[PDB]
Write an enzyme that holds these catalytic residues in place. Structure first.
Site, mmCIF file in Angstrom:
data_model
loop_
_atom_site.group_PDB
_atom_site.id
_atom_site.type_symbol
_atom_site.label_atom_id
_atom_site.label_comp_id
_atom_site.label_asym_id
_atom_site.label_seq_id
_atom_site.Cartn_x
_atom_site.Cartn_y
_atom_site.Cartn_z
ATOM 1 C CG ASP A 115 -66.810 -10.443 20.222
ATOM 2 O OD1 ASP A 115 -66.077 -9.612 20.810
ATOM 3 O OD2 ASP A 115 -66.324 -11.407 19.581
ATOM 4 C CG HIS A 157 -63.001 -12.546 19.694
ATOM 5 N ND1 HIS A 157 -63.839 -11.442 19.793
ATOM 6 C CD2 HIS A 157 -61.755 -12.056 19.624
ATOM 7 C CE1 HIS A 157 -63.116 -10.340 19.801
ATOM 8 N NE2 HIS A 157 -61.843 -10.690 19.710
ATOM 9 C CG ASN A 165 -55.120 -6.675 18.254
ATOM 10 O OD1 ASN A 165 -55.145 -5.964 19.255
ATOM 11 N ND2 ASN A 165 -56.025 -7.611 18.022
ATOM 12 C CB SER A 196 -60.313 -8.363 21.402
ATOM 13 O OG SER A 196 -60.650 -7.947 20.090
#
Ligand SMILES: [Ca+2]
Ligand SMILES: [Ca+2]
Length: 269
Positions: A32, A62, A153, A215
Site C-alpha cells: 500500500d 490509506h 470502486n 480497500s
C-alpha cells in the site's frame, strides 16, 4: 477507551478472539502507501519499492488505515483489528498520491514471497491487465503466500486487476444492511465480501478516520485469513481461501457477492 468498529463486530472477530485466536505468529504484508508509526499499531518490518520514497512510513494515510483494520492492537485505546496480534509488514508499493506502477506492485509481491509472508493484502487496483502483475501474483502464490485484493470502486459489473486474476482472492464491499455497497465492483472472479462503508481505523498523526471503499473491505478478509492460519498452522493458502468462502454467510447471487459475507466465527469453529 477502545472502540470496536462496526465491521469488526459484523465479521464476528471478537468471537474468534474469545477462542484465543488473534493472528499470533502470522506474517501479513500490507502492499500500500506505507504504514506510519501509531500508538495502536505494531509494525515489524517492511520494504519500499517506490522510486524516491525509501522509507515505509505513510505519506498518504490509506495504508495506515488498511493496516489498522487488519491488526489495530487490543488494548485501552483506539480501535481493534480483526487479527490484533498479526505480524504487520509495511510494503510500500504506492506513492503519497495513492498511485504506483505495475512494476512496484510486482516487486512488492516478489518480496512478500521471498520473505515468507503468509498473507498479502492488496487494497489497490489497475484498470487493465498486466502480464507482470499476473506473473507476480502467480509467483507469490506458488511460494505459499495468500494474495487478497480489492475488487475496486467503480461500481461496474467487472472487477479490477489483480483481483480478477485467478490466484488472487477478490473482495467486494458491503454496507451496514449487508447489501452490496453501490461502488463495489462485482462480477466474474468475485470471491467474498466484507464491510467497506464508514470504516473507522488508524490514520497518520496518531489519529483515527473513517473511510469507504473495497480497500476497507479487503483487510477484513486478510485479517480473517490470519485467524484461520493461527488455528491451522499447516494449511496452505488455497485451503484457507476455500475455507473462508465455505464458511461465509451467503447473501445471494455469487455474481454480486461471491460466497457472501466473511465470518471469522464460522471459519475458526
Ligand atoms: Ca486498540
Ligand atoms: Ca481473483
Amino acid at each position: 477507551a477502545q472502540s470496536v468498529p462496526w465491521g469488526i463486530s459484523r465479521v464476528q472477530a471478537p468471537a474468534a478472539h474469545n477462542r484465543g485466536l488473534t493472528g499470533s505468529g502470522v506474517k501479513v504484508a500490507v502492499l500500500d502507501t506505507g504504514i506510519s508509526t501509531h500508538p495502536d499499531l505494531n509494525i515489524r518490518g517492511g520494504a519500499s519499492f517506490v522510486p524516491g520514497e525509501p522509507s515505509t512510513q505513510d505519506g498518504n494515510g490509506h495504508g495506515t488505515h488498511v493496516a489498522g483494520t487488519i491488526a489495530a492492537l487490543n488494548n485501552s485505546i483506539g480501535v481493534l483489528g480483526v487479527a490484533p496480534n498479526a505480524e504487520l509488514y509495511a510494503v510500500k508499493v504506492l506513492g503519497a498520491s495513492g498511485g504506483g506502477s505495475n512494476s512496484s506492485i510486482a516487486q512488492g509481491l516478489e518480496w512478500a514471497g521471498n520473505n515468507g509472508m503468509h498473507v498479502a493484502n492488496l487494497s489497490l487496483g489497475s484498470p487493465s491487465p498486466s502480464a507482470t502483475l499476473e506473473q507476480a501474483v502467480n509467483s507469490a502464490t506458488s511460494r505459499g503466500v495468500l494474495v487478497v485484493a480489492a475488487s475496486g470502486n467503480s461500481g461496474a459489473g467487472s472487477i479490477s486487476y489483480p483481483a480478477r486474476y485467478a490466484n488472487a482472492m477478490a473482495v467486494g464491499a458491503t454496507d451496514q444492511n449487508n447489501n452490496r455497497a453501490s461502488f463495489s465492483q462485482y462480477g466474474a472472479g468475485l470471491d467474498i465480501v466484507a464491510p467497506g462503508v464508514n470504516v473507522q481505523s488508524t490514520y497518520p498523526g496518531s489519529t483515527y478516520a473513517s473511510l469507504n471503499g473495497t480497500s476497507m473491505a479487503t483487510p477484513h478478509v486478510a485479517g480473517a485469513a490470519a485467524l484461520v492460519k493461527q488455528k491451522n498452522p499447516s494449511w496452505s493458502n488455497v485451503q484457507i481461501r476455500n475455507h473462508l468462502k465455505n464458511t461465509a454467510t451467503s447473501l445471494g447471487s455469487t455474481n454480486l457477492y461471491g460466497s457472501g459475507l466473511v465470518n471469522a466465527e464460522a471459519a475458526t469453529r
